[PDB]
Amino acid sequence: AKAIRQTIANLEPFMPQGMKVVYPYDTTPVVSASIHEVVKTLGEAILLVFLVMYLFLQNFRATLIPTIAVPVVLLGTFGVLAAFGFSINTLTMFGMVLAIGLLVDDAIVVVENVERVMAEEGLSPREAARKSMGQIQGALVGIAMVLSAVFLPMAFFGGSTGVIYRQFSITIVSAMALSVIVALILTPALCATMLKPGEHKGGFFGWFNRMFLSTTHGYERGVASILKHRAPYLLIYVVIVAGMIWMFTRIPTAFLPDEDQGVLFAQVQTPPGSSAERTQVVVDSMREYLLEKESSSVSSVFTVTGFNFAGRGQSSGMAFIMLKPWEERPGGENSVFELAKRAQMHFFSFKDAMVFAFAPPSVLELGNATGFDLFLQDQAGVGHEVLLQARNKFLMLAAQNPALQRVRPNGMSDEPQYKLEIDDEKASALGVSLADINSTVSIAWGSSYVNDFIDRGRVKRVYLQGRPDARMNPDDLSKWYVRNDKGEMVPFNAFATGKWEYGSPKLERYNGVPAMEILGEPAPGLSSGDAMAAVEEIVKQLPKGVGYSWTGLSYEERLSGSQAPALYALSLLVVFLCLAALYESWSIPFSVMLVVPLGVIGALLATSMRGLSNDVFFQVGLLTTIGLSAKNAILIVEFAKELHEQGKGIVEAAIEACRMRLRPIVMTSLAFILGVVPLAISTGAGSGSQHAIGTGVIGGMVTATVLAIFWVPLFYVAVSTL
Amino acid sequence: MSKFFIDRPIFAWVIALVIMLAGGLSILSLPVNQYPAIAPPAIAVQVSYPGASAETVQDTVVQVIEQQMNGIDNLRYISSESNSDGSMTITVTFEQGTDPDIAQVQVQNKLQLATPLLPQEVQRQGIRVTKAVKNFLMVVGVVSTDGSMTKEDLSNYIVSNIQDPLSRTKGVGDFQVFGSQYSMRIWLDPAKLNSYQLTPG
Amino acid sequence: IAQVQVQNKLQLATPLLPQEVQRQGIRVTKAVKNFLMVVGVVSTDGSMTKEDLSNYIVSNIQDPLSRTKGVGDFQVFGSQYSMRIWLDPAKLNSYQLTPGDVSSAIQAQNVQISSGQLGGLPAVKGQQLNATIIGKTRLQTAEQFENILL
Amino acid sequence: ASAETVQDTVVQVIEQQMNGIDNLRYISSESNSDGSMTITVTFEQGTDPD
Amino acid sequence: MSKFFIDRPIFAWVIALVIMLAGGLSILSLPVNQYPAIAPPAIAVQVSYPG
């Protein structure tokens, strides 16, 4: 787009008088506004996390340590994804926004560790740094192995889903590995330079910290009802897991949510066998409607007659509609989908033409509309009319099917066409040779091409055709005379009659055999597998001799299969293996392996009551939710088992570990809340992507942290003691 | 060994901001787009045979070309289309991750042996083989303000002055003008073409 | 890239080739020495003959398996049908004809001419009729090549 | 041929049809007196010449 | 290098069966054929000159 605008800037001073160049249709400002919106939400997420840590802790020179460790890991993520050759898009920026919490947690861990040892001994940093590095040096490479095992095996998949998950996988694993090495080399060597060995502060913020300590003490005497009631809660746990397994059938599965683009298409198609006047009337009335009745959300209507995306002809049209930019149409009633719905009911009021108004999909490169497509082809040579009847049967049986919505032919129907029959023997008996008849017909109607000619510095071409008044009706196919073999003139009335017959104006083929298309889209609630299965019930009632074949994205989603159960099975298996690596035992890491459904319940509930379907962003949100809930529970279980093997009981070491760990766990949980909020409720370009990948993460992590922080030591004791 | 890497804090400052500096250079050396390579590399073979029918375009050009699209590596499905005004397309779609220039080489190699079997007019119209994806990127549309120029004036201006420097830029693989250039039409009056014992031949 | 270099140097080779080798077009294919699998059809009832089997293979088996993965170049043991005209030199002597005259007549009969369109653009003002005029079509059966008049 | 004969029948046809080649920088062409023709298509740096 | 692992056998076992797991996922995606690309690449330019 930049090179095209530069070429028009180099060609603009040589315009003639009053020659303006305008841009009616353009799909680049949605890309620019989307990347600007995700880098802006990155900026305010970093600003809100800094503001929360500076207002809640009231100390600047310890908050300075993660807020300088975040741009290092960010720019390192940029460089690492640039080393493999991957582009900055919405997908890697979503990876960075979801990796903010997983990179800030480690800096918070090492800063709180040096604060704790500073409060405990206050001695020289060398040997105490050796000890603190001895604790956290194994822990950081342990969580690197854990989060690599839980997130990296989505990279080993093929297809469109395989490319999307390898973008997310290497983005999160790159930010993880950069966070590990940057924390290990930098954050002790940055917290060990310019600090002070804060306590007993005056007025209102110190009393608020006393109130926070009082709520911690209230937690300390509120968990007694959990610890004494040791039996009951496991049946509630089984209820939650069974609700999760029930809930995976409720939310429908898709590929990627239909985003806003600022682009609407309209497909004009008159009752065919029509001229250009009727199509021009329907086109001009559509332009008048969209310009005087809906000028609040439509900027410019570039209407082309003769080139809808079905086919070409004299009886077709198309209006390239560019909507206003997103600062002039706020509110959910002026989106492209509500404008499409409010325009379609008025396009049904055009009693002349069949007008269908559709919006393009999310990824423009995949196709040109939303939903599925399939090419109904033949194999045996059953006949073009039999195949057209079979396509009409398919269309009516799908329009009566409650699992489909607005199935289309994406083609033109049979219309009158004038078959003139040259009386062969009578023409050749009267004397005229047949090559003269064919030359007369082809040049007099088919607009023959003779040679070229130059003009004004450019070689253009010369055509040759009859008048606009001597080919317009079958009475004017008799004005043309063909020369005899002796200088006489023979009309076309002598040897050419006329019969009106039947045929389609757009003939299609697919894999070397004739075909017709069927375009459409599934129901607003149903998945893509249900539309697939409904087509599989409609095709079974077709005649013998035809056969379906899928095209486009449908070819991938019908031939590849679904490797998401294998994804979750392998990912949870190898993260269990890295937990048994971190803990050196076999029965202990089940107290973190078991936590996963209690994590994903919040994502399932939050994408249920918001109406956000299952897509790739929902599964990325589930994986990061599982990873952060496990990353909190392993610090709980690891430091509890470490204080158990230092020579104390199970429950007492668990209680002192969890009380010492509640402030960083809830702190990084609330920081990741404040990170993921300004894209889950945002309004602008790239809406539905941000809504899905924010809503799943916020719901899952908000229930996961403050319910696992109660329940992880419960079944930790239940699987270590019993 | 150990103390050469632990005792020096600004050594860690330098390593962290060399990572930041390589990140800044890699930001200003990367592309920006919206989604990665999802759709497979298509290739279209389109020509406009004027004054024809749907059956004429089909059984003279489309079947003759696609009977020679055999023996192409990494091919997924071939799908063609022939309209009524005389224009057509074969949309060959390859597998994801194939190399589009070697792909265009193979498709052009397999249709150069079907090109001499075509009609002479189909050859003289100029067969275009482009590798571009299915969407319209942007429409450059010129508009006269005063009203002293009609539709085909502006279409001539596009095809004669905008189209030729714009189709060679870095990124544009296929174009489509909404109109046509000028071409010196000659309208045969069949009464006067009758008067002098002459034919259109 | 080996095929690229071969048909790069072949482009320089082609001007010194004869006109007819240039009008015909020569093809460049990656050579594989072995035959993987021979796929063939037979006639159980003895009804349909050998050329019928070669017709059915080239018409309906060669096309649906040359697009698939792995199947590259191949070789058909036979060839498809073709409306084969057998001239008779006694009956060409009988009528003062020539095989060139039969060739010119058959190139004049089954032409698929672009026969235009009713109401095609540019249209006179007030036009409401449009139809794609099908002129002659190229002939299909034996009784239609059998009635070519010379 | 002349200069303008070659320019109006060969050079300008090949320039009108040669659209959309990969990594194209600038095309230059010249028509000589003795009927010859030379189009020197210049690709940009790093283009593999095959 | 083993003296870390006599004291810690479970981490050795989990390295072992992580290698087994990656190999088992590698079994189910490799192409099974008879011989590798032993044959040299060959290009067969061919045309039917008339008669």
Q: Which DSSP string corresponds to B101-138?
A: HHHHHHHHHHHTTTGGGS-HHHHHH--EEE---SS--E
Alpha-carbon span B88 to B53, nearest angstrom: 11
- As a dihedral over the C-alpha atoms of residue A525, residue A528, residue A533, residue A538, rounded to 10 degrees, the angle is 80
How many H-runs (helices) and E-runs (strands) does chain E carry? 2, 1
CA gap E34, D33 in Å, rounded = 63
E strand intervals along B73-201: 75-82, 87-94, 128-130, 138-144, 187-188
What's the token pair of residue A19?
């020659």
- Provide the residue type at E34 as one letter: Q
CB A703 within 8 A of CB A606: no
Q: Cβ contacts of residue B36 below 8 Å, gap of 6+?
A: A86, A87, A89, A91, A163, A164, A167
* B139/A302 touch (CB, cutoff 8 Å), yes or no: yes
Burial of B100 (0-12, 13-18, 19+ CB in 10 A): middle
> What is the token pair recorded at A672?
């990741």
| Method for this entry | cryo-EM
The tokens describing B56, both together, are 């004429």
For the purposes of burial, counting CB atoms within 10 Å of the CB of A162, is it exposed (0-12), middle (13-18) or buried (19 or more)?
middle
Partner-chain contact A365 B166, CB within 8 Å = no
Q: Determine the residue among C60, C67, C137 to mutate to test chain B binding: the one whose Cβ has the most chain B Cβ atoms within 10 Å.
A: C67
Q: Tell me the backbone φ, ψ of residue C139, rounded to 5 degrees.
A: -75, 160
What 3-state class would DSSP assign to A88? strand
Does residue A403 contact residue A471 with C-beta atoms inside 8 Å? no
Contact call for residues B168 and D20 (beta carbons, < 8 A):
yes
Q: Which of A29, A303, A551, A92 is nearest to B137 (CA)?
A: A29
C2 Cβ under 8 Å from any chain A Cβ:
no
Joined tokens for residue A28: 């680049």
Cβ neighbours around A75 below 10 Å, total: 22
* Strand residues in B23-82 grouped as ranges (E): 42-48, 75-82
Asked if D34 is an interface residue toward chain C (Cβ–Cβ < 8 A), one would say no
The Cα–Cα gap between A373 and A550 comes to 6
Q: How far apart are CA A128 and CA A328, in angstroms?
A: 60
The pair of structure tokens assigned to A323 is 């909507």
CATH number of A415-503: 3.30.2090.10
Q: Between the CA of residue A693 and those of A148, A323, A608, A624, B23, what are the distances in Å? A: 20, 26, 14, 10, 25
Angle ∠(A448,A454,A457) on CA atoms, nearest 5: 145
The rounded radius of gyration (Å) of the Cα atoms in chain A is 35
Taking CB atoms and an 8 Å limit, are E11 and A581 in contact across chains?
yes
Q: Nearest 5°: CA angle at B178, between B188 and B94?
A: 115
DSSP annotation of A477? G
Identify the chains in contact with A, defined as 3+ C-beta pairs within 8 A.
Answer: B, C, D, E
Residue A662 to chain B, least CA–CA distance (Å): 30
Q: Measured between alpha carbons, how far is A354 from A341 in angstroms, rounded to an integer?
A: 16
Burial of A289 (0-12, 13-18, 19+ CB in 10 A): middle
Residues of B in contact with C24 (CB under 8 A): 116
> Rounded to a whole number, what is the distance in Å from the CA of B172 to chain D's nearest CA?
7
Q: Does D22 touch chain C (CB under 8 A)?
A: no
Task: Show residues of chain E in contact with C7, CB under 8 Å.
Answer: 45
Q: Return the ∠ at Cα B147 (arms to B142 and B149), rounded to 5°.
A: 65
Residue A409 backbone dihedrals phi, psi, to 5 degrees: -80, -25
Question: Which is it for strands B75-82 and A507-510: parallel, antiparallel or unpaired?
Answer: antiparallel
Please report residues of B whose CB lies closer than 8 A to that of C114: 49-53, 56, 86, 121
Omega before residue A514 within 30° of 0, cis: no
Task: Using CB atoms within 10 Å of the CB of residue B191, give its burial: 0 to 12 exposed, 13 to 18 middle, 19+ buried.
Answer: exposed
Residue of B32, B55, B146 with shortest CB distance to A87: B32
Rounded Cα–Cα distance for residues A451 and A125 (Å): 91
Domain that holds residue C84: 79-150
Q: Among all chains, which residue has been given the structure tokens 């493999």? A: A84
* B-chain residues near A193 (CB < 8 A): 9
Q: Give A129-190 as a DSSP string.
A: HHHHHHHHHHHHHHHHHHHHHHHGGGSS--SHHHHHHHHHHHHHHHHHHHHHHHHHHHSHHH
Three-state DSSP class for A500?
strand
Four-residue CA torsion sign, B151, B154, B155, B156 = positive
Contact (Cβ atoms closer than 8 angstroms) between residue B66 and residue B78:
yes
Q: What is the dihedral of CA B188, B191, B192, B198, to 10 degrees?
A: 80
* D12 → chain A, closest CA residue: A459
Q: Directed axis angle between helix A160-186 and helix B9-27, to 10°? A: 150
CA distance B122 to C10: 25
CB A421 within 8 Å of CB A498: yes
Output the furthest CA–CA distance in chain D (Å, rounded). 38
Nearest alpha-carbon partner for B167 in A4, A63, A466: A4
Q: Which residue has the tokens 């590399």?
A: B41
Task: Answer whether C99 touches A (CB < 8 Å).
Answer: no
Query: Residue A420 forms beta bridges with which residues?
Result: A498
Ramachandran sector of residue A375 (left: φ over 0; alpha: ψ -120 to 50; beta: rest): beta
- List all residues 6 or more positions away from A165 whose beta carbon is below 8 Å from its beta carbon: A154, A155, A157, A616, A619, A620
Inter-chain contact D24–B168, Cβ cutoff 8 Å?
yes
Spatial separation of the C-alpha atoms in residues A533 and A528, rounded to whole Å: 9
CB nearest to C114's CB, from A274, A442, A500: A442
| Nearest-by-Cβ selection for C112 from B56, B77, B112 | B56
- Taking phi over 0 as left and psi of -120 to 50 as alpha, with beta for the rest, D35 belongs to left
| Structure-block tokens of residue C104 | 């010119």
Question: What distance in Å separates the CA atoms of residue A29 and residue A35, rounded to the nearest whole number?
Answer: 10
A319/A520 Cα distance (integer angstroms): 20
Nearest Cα neighbor of A28 from A236, A199, A263, A217 is: A263
CA–CA min distance C12, chain D (Å): 14
**How many helices (H) and strands (E) are present in chain C, helices listed first?**
7, 1
Phi, psi of A30 (to 5 degrees): -70, -35
